[PDB]
Each structure stands twice: as structure tokens, then as C-alpha cells.
Amino acid sequence: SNRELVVDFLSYKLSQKGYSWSSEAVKQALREAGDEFELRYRRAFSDLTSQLHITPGTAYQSFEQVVNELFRDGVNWGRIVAFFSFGGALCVESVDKEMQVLVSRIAAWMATYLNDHLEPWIQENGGWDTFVELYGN
């Protein structure tokens, strides 16, 4: 379910680049918000991308550093969307550098963070149905 959302979002962003991974309302609303975040914040996106030096020995560190930064002042739906776009960017970028092996690992790190750290805020703020209600269509 957190798993499901992650795989869905990551599969989508990978597919938009021509790569193959290899609640529908929640899933669509999340993809759509990701597309829109990535355009509105395309400068922040490219600042990030051009400063990730991905290696497998630093990838977790890079993920954690950015995710800690992202939620440092609190959690809101927009930041949750940005969290998924970041993981998408990380995956796309790993494939570019021929570190395809990291994709499955990035998905695991993402689900764990959701499960451990984002879940209490999500449940307290109406769950994903409330996300859909506020930012769907």
C-alpha cells in the first residue's frame, strides 16, 4: 500500500524517460501532482539533479540528507509530493549513470520512510483520501 504507491509513482516517472520498472484515485492524483510540482519547481529540481553525484556507497546518505532537509520544518501534502518527485529523480538519475541496481533500493528506502516517519502525519491529516479530496482532478 505504501509499497503500492511508491512503485506506481516510480514506474510512472521511469516510463516518462523511456525506462521500464520491470487507490487508483490516490495513485492518479499523486502522479498528476508530481507532474505539476516538477514544472512549478523545475529550478529546484535541476539544482538537485546537477548536485547529486550518485554512487552506491553514498546513495542512502544523499537520500537521507535531502529527505531530512525536506521535512525539517514540518510535513504537509506538498512536501509529501516533493518527496515522491525526489525519489523519482533519484531513480531516473541512477539509471542514467548505469546504477539501475539502486532503483529497487530507493523504492525500499521510500516505503520505510513513509511507513516509519510519514504515516503518523498522514493518518492525523485524513489519510490519502483527504489528499485526493483536496488535490485530485
Ligand SMILES: CN(C)CC[C@H](CSc1ccccc1)Nc1ccc(S(=O)(=O)NC(=O)c2ccc(N3CCN(Cc4ccccc4-c4ccc(Cl)cc4)CC3)cc2)cc1[N+](=O)[O-]
Ligand atoms: C487542484 N490542483 C491542480 C492543485 C495543484 C496545487 C499546486 S501543484 C503543487 C505545488 C507544490 C507541491 C505539490 C504540488 N497543489 C498543491 C498546492 C499546495 C500544497 S501545500 O500547501 O500542501 N504545499 C505546498 O504548496 C508546497 C510544498 C512544498 C514545496 N517545496 C518547494 C521546494 N522544494 C525544494 C526542496 C527543499 C528541501 C529539500 C528538498 C527539496 C526538493 C524536493 C524534491 C525535488 Cl525533485 C527537488 C528539491 C521542497 C518542497 C512547495 C510548495 C500542495 C499541493 N499538492 O500537494 O497537490
Ligand SMILES: [Cl-]
Ligand atoms: Cl516538525
